Design a protein around this ligand. Structure first.
Ligand SMILES: Nc1ncnc2c1ncn2[C@@H]1O[C@H](COP(=O)(O)OP(=O)(O)O)[C@@H](O)[C@H]1O
Ligand SMILES: Nc1ncnc2c1ncn2[C@@H]1O[C@H](COP(=O)(O)OP(=O)(O)O)[C@@H](O)[C@H]1O
Ligand SMILES: Nc1ncnc2c1ncn2[C@@H]1O[C@H](COP(=O)(O)OP(=O)(O)O)[C@@H](O)[C@H]1O
Lengths: 20, 721, 269
């Protein structure tokens, strides 16, 4: 659902910011 | 079904787990969906599922924060279910845990919680514990009140409260700052080997009672001081939950005869009563030195007592004894016999990647400035161990807190959290720390996968391919070697003029193969010969066996022959004490250990011919002086570190330097650079190396191999056909 | 065993050693096994302590007391006969000795077959190839090899099915097979304990492995086999058997294979 994908988008941003 | 084995994660996020796609399809969930984790003692947690290329199908990867809240440990199994009805909350109340808030004061919400939750959209459940790092502290918080229940996503528009006294940690939960596996940097391969040996006996004792398989009962760790030997022993006990008991040589030796043996026995009795348990004996060589090396009765007695207690582990169920020593050969050999400490793990010295990991671990709580480059530090910190890298992080923080924070701080119990969070450590602070620290393991050899690639070697395209066939083909295509009855070579010797890249060749193949590179240099061969300590050759080969897959490179094979006079010397033969031990170890080394031996010499006419016989370095490769296109490649590679003017004609220079080796082309590059520096300095009493600097260098640089030596090298290669 | 006796205080080590002999007589027939003999009775020149000398003397007198302790045999294990008090090897006591050594390729296969009796092996597992690869390994190393290979199969299948309880279902164990990949992994993690020792065995080289030299092959048979195949002919004609032969000539012409081939045909070590 949408609230779960909103949490996922924030988790992906934190992960990619640390990887780059 | 829907049951996954709990393992470690690479993603450290407090609300995320990683699954392999076949389990995401079985659970009918998609990347980014929220799931609930069902742990032990009626405890659960909420998280987001992502994916990676490292999780196996049967495993679920999570961090310590999730395992602690679920009251589960590595190796356990939990149930997973989707929960698509997750929504965001409107209000949460989060308070710190007293155990982690010490030395600091101020608005902890603004420093920690607000950066943590704001625009973060984290799923949380009431009662969850999570860690926020910063300001040189690691502070964990508990969720004590939420309006939605039992879980919700914390949105940036929610109200976050933080009013009340710090909370005391409950007995059902462990502190997130307790030593665990995430505190260990380098030597991750060694930790994996230990986990394979230890996790099951302690986490699943039913398997070894029900199955006719023998557990390990002891593990010996060895390497220089400060490498993490004692850190691993503690981390393992904390992660598995086994009762930990600490023993150390000096303390036991500080007791009188009869007291030392009684205390040693009690340590084993306590481990059994509290089983599952792990006993760690530090300074094993100090508590149990070789009996044949000591005349003291008490020291011989304590060795016998330790050996008896180790053998008693056949009766003490679920007790594993670990030990640490500086050298595997400094302890009584009885300890290493089948049983007791028959399993050993070589910790050694962290490699460049591990050293960076250690620097990153000990800076997780520190603010670093944009100019900080810990990878550059890890590359410069040769001879340093984890204890030294941790010291460098603390010492660099000392400069940051002295330069800026000392003018902010008070002579009081606590420091404001707001100012500590903004305290960045600069590059000059790590550079200062590096000058103050002194490596504790600079004499010991550092064995690691080298960073030399094929692109770093000019020319020799065919030799590069030959090394791939010598090292990779025997294991990538073993069915073709069996089909044609081919016996793979155990090693190759390089010969020819000096300065042609023989050292880089061995490193480059080790790098591509992801194999450890062990470098033995002339001074080591000479030390063993002169000091009549050729027995140390066995330790060199033993490193290759433990470091496998690896490449064992013996440089300057003629170093002893030259030290014996080379062309004149004595009236004897090429054999000597050290080469005899090397040849013996070569014959006793099997290709099944994935160890490939490479030799190099610039004077093959004065080395023991035995090393060239079948079964030894029977593959011979001639490395001539670089040709026209290779010399250009060498000049271009060597100049990658300096600005070079567009007028510099490197092809013209290479055409003139017909008799120059790659090392001699470096001399030209270095001279042209130094000449550019000289002129640049004089102009202030230039921005790049001009053609005039290379042409001037051509009048000072010389070939190291004379025309007579070039013909000798070619005639030798011709003689061998 | 050494450590059990040597760890005890003066007077305790001697009493405990004497009790062991008293119990063997009381329960005769009996066998006393002394492991790590060199730990209690090392070569005299290697120990000077008063306590160590006394316990060695106590063992020597207890061994001599076996004249009265009927039906009691004492066996001891050491690494080298030359590391222990030579007095032990005097007539009686420990005068008889047997060289156990290490297994050869055939013995290693037998050991692997023994330690796999309870193991379910996959069709790809071939213990003969393993026995040939495990050079320098002893029985305790091959037992560890089988254990490690079993552990790999357990992790892959037992945890995969998610069976966590106090007991293990017999049906699951019945289907738990150990593949050759698990043995190869265990071989990579195993480390031979006898790799430093000289290997003595009957060689696999036969005469068919050597090209040419037909007359030399016969000459070795005359020198090595005939003295024991026809001992009455050597005595009858007053022959003095040769104790050895030297080979000379260019290198790489089969000098080593010739020595092995004759050792093989006569089944000599
Ligand atoms: N391999 C390693 N990885 C991470 N940290 C390490 C490692 N080795 C040592 N350290 C750090 O260095 C210090 C070692 O101190 P201690 O635990 O007393 O070990 P030692 O036995 O070397 O004295 C600790 O702060 C530890 O975190
Ligand atoms: N073909 C080449 N490509 C790149 N660098 C080279 C080459 N040949 C020599 N060099 C440089 O010259 C140096 C000397 O090489 P080395 O193999 O150590 O020679 P030697 O073993 O005879 O002393 C190396 O550090 C390398 O940087
Ligand atoms: N007559 C032969 N028939 C078959 N192979 C031979 C013969 N002579 C030599 N070889 C090969 O040459 C190698 C070296 O022989 P070897 O007898 O070991 O040399 P050396 O006795 O000088 O050490 C052997 O491995 C063998 O394969």
């Amino acid at each position: 659902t949408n609230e779960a994908q909103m949490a996922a988008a924030a988790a992906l941003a934190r992960l990619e910011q640390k990887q780059s | 079904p829907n049951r996954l084995i709990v393992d470690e994660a690479i993603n450290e996020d407090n609300s995320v787990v990683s699954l392999s796609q076949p389990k995401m399809d079985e659970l009918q969930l998609f990347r980014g969906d929220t799931v609930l984790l069902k742990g032990k003692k009626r405890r659960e947690a909420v998280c987001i599922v992502l994916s990676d290329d490292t999780c196996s199908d049967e495993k679920i990867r999570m961090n310590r924060v999730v395992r602690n809240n679920l009251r589960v440990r590595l190796g356990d199994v939990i149930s997973i279910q989707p929960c698509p009805d997750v929504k965001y909350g409107k209000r949460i109340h989060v308070l710190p845990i007293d155990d982690t808030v010490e030395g600091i004061t101020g608005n902890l919400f603004e420093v920690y919680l607000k950066p943590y939750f704001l625009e973060a959209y984290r799923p949380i459940r009431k009662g969850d514990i999570f860690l926020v790092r910063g300001g040189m502290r690691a502070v964990e918080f508990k969720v004590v009140e939420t309006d939605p229940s039992p879980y919700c996503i914390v949105a940036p528009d929610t109200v976050i409260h933080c009013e009340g006294e710090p909370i005391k940690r409950e007995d059902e939960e462990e502190s997130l700052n307790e030593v665990g596996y995430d505190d260990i940097g380098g030597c991750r391969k060694q930790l994996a080997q230990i986990k394979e040996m230890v996790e099951l006996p302690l986490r699943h004792p039913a398997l070894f009672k029900a199955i006719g398989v023998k557990p390990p009962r002891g593990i010996l760790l060895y390497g220089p001081p400060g490498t993490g030997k004692t850190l691993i022993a503690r981390a393992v006990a904390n992660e598995t939950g086994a009762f930990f008991f600490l023993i150390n040589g000096p303390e036991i030796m500080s007791k009188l005869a009869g007291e030392s043996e009684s205390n040693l026995r009690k340590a084993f009795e306590e481990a059994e009563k509290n089983a599952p348990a792990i006993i760690f004996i530090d300074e094993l060589d100090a508590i149990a030195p070789k009996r044949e090396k000591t005349h003291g009765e008490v020291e011989r007695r304590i060795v016998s007592q330790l050996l008896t207690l180790m053998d008693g582990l056949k009766q003490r169920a679920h007790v594993i004894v670990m030990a640490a020593t500086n050298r595997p050969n400094s302890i009584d050999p009885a300890l290493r016999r089948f049983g007791r400490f028959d399993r050993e793990v070589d910790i050694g010295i962290p490699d460049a990647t591990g050293r960076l990991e250690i620097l990153q671990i000990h800076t997780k709580n520190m603010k670093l400035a944009d100019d900080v480059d810990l990878e550059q530090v890890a590359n410069e910190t040769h001879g340093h161990v984890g204890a030294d890298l941790a010291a460098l992080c603390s010492e660099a923080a000392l400069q940051a807190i002295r330069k800026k924070m000392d003018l902010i701080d008070l002579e009081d119990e606590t420091i404001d959290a707001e100012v500590m969070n903004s305290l960045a450590v600069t590059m000059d602070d790590f550079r200062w720390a590096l000058s103050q620290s002194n490596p504790s393991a600079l004499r010991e050899t550092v064995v690691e996968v080298p960073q030399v690639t094929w692109e770093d070697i000019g020319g020799l395209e065919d030799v590069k391919r030959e090394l791939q066939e010598l090292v990779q083909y025997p294991v990538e295509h073993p069915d073709k070697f069996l089909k044609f009855g081919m016996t793979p070579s155990k090693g190759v010797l390089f010969y020819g003029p000096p300065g042609c890249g023989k050292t880089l060749l061995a490193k480059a193949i080790a790098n591509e193969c992801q194999a450890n590179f062990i470098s033995i240099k002339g001074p080591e061969l000479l030390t063993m010969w002169f000091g009549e300590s050729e027995a140390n050759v066995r330790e060199i080969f033993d490193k290759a066996r433990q470091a496998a897959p690896c490449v064992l490179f013996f440089d300057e094979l003629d170093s002893i022959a030259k030290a014996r006079g080379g062309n004149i010397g004595d009236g004897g033969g090429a054999a000597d004490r050290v080469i005899n031990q090397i040849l013996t170890e070569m014959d006793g080394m099997s290709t099944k250990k994935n160890v490939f031996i490479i030799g190099a010499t610039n004077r093959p006419d004065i080395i023991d011919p035995a090393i060239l016989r079948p079964g030894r370095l029977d593959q011979l490769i001639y490395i001539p002086l670089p040709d026209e296109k290779s010399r250009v490649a060498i000049l271009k590679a060597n100049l990658r570190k300096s600005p070079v003017a567009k007028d510099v004609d490197l092809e013209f220079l290479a055409k003139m330097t017909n008799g120059f080796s790659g090392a001699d082309l470096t001399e030209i590059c270095q001279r042209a650079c130094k000449l550019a520096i000289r002129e640049s300095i004089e102009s202030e009493i230039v921005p790049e190396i001009r053609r005039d600097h290379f042409e001037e260098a051509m009048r000072f640089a010389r070939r190291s191999v004379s025309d007579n030596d070039i013909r000798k090298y070619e005639m030798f290669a011709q003689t061998l056909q």
